[PDB]
């Protein structure tokens, strides 16, 4: 009972690349059918961490539920949530990954944020997020109002502090900036905490899953 990915990569599918939402949703599958060289993946360029490990974790699943870990319109009262890009276009229209939110400043401010989530799903929860590395200082100031930014992510099984490095990368899909993608599996009962003062590409949707 295989999961057909079509023109998408696991990266495209799991992040919610706009071209990848046309695929039929599944709650279980024995293996993953995926084109050798898939067209749509990370529509916004960046490094996807532990990618091979993640494909293996997702290889076979007995239960799969997408849920809104951090509701878009509720979680972020003092930040702007509408961020979109032509690099992630859908129907000729600038857009973004279904499963992440591009947070930016609001009314001249990007207030320190702290958002936590407790896994009460009784199944492992796959959580994904990103860290944005602007191509220059102008974009850094315009988006986040802060030049010295950090993103911090913590649970019982994950602990990292990220800092953007602002500089040009080779132009890919019309971007010289980058987004690095990260993920963790959260134990039942464990809590994960995100803190940032800029540059967080927040989780919007997460995945409760079983593998056997």
């Amino acid at each position: 009972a295989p999961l057909q990915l079509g023109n998408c990569s696991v990266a495209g599918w799991i992040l919610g690349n706009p071209e990848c939402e046309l695929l039929i949703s599944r709650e279980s599958w024995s293996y993953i059918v995926e084109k050798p060289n898939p067209e749509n993946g990370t529509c916004y360029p960046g490094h996807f961490a532990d990618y091979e490990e993640l494909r293996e974790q997702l290889s076979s699943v007995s239960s799969f539920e997408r849920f809104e870990i951090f509701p878009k319109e509720s979680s972020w009262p003092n930040h702007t949530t509408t961020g979109v890009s032509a690099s992630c276009s859908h129907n000729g229209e600038s857009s973004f990954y279904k499963n992440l939110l591009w947070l930016t400043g609001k009314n001249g401010l990007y207030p320190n944020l702290s958002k936590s989530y407790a896994n009460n799903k009784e199944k492992e929860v796959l959580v994904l997020w990103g860290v944005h590395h602007p191509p220059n200082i102008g974009d850094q100031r315009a988006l986040y109002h802060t030049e010295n930014a950090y993103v911090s992510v913590v649970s019982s099984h994950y602990s990292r502090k990220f800092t953007p490095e602002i500089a040009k990368r080779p132009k890919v899909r019309d971007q010289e900036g980058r987004i690095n993608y990260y993920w963790t599996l959260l134990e039942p009962g464990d809590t994960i905490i995100f803190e940032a003062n800029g540059n967080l590409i927040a989780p919007r949707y997460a995945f409760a899953l079983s593998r056997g």
Partner: antibody
Amino acid sequence: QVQLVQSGAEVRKPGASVKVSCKASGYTFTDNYIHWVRQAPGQGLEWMGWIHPNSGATKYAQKFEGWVTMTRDTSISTVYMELSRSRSDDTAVYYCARAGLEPRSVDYYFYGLDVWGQGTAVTVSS
Amino acid sequence: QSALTQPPSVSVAPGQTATITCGGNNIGRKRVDWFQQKPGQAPVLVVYERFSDSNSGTTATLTISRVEAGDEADYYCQVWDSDSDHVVFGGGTKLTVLG
């Protein structure tokens, strides 16, 4: 509705301070950047910098950095532009403009200048 | 002379179509704000069936269809330069409606 009203024309001697004010109304003052742009007689428009009334953060054009100071008073919805050491160079009309045109993408994340003040004529002579 | 390049002057008879071009680095991938300035007045942001906008590579174009007397003005293009965090204005185009 939304408008910016600036103070009146000024004549100053060089080396003196020139302070121009801009009062905003018709909207929430703390929402938007306020820019200053100037126009010398017979010439075009040159950006001087902005101030955000909410944070008080400022940014000046390289050419004006160190010569100009922008401030805000939220209680009276007014921003100021000040030339601390004025020169004959500084004779021009000065505008304030509200940056209320919201950007549609993070690819080009710049708020556009949608509402301008009427301008203040500043003359600097000894 | 200016970071953005505009033709110094355009003259057009009423009813005709006026076209104003703006040249600049990566202009085609940005929003180019146009400003209309009439004599003795402050600039106003040009907002928009007559007035339309169109970019391409290093060229942004403001098109005014069926020109009227109230269209006569100086027009300035403007963008934000990402790298130096700096607002830049074109040198302006004096648009005359031949009356």
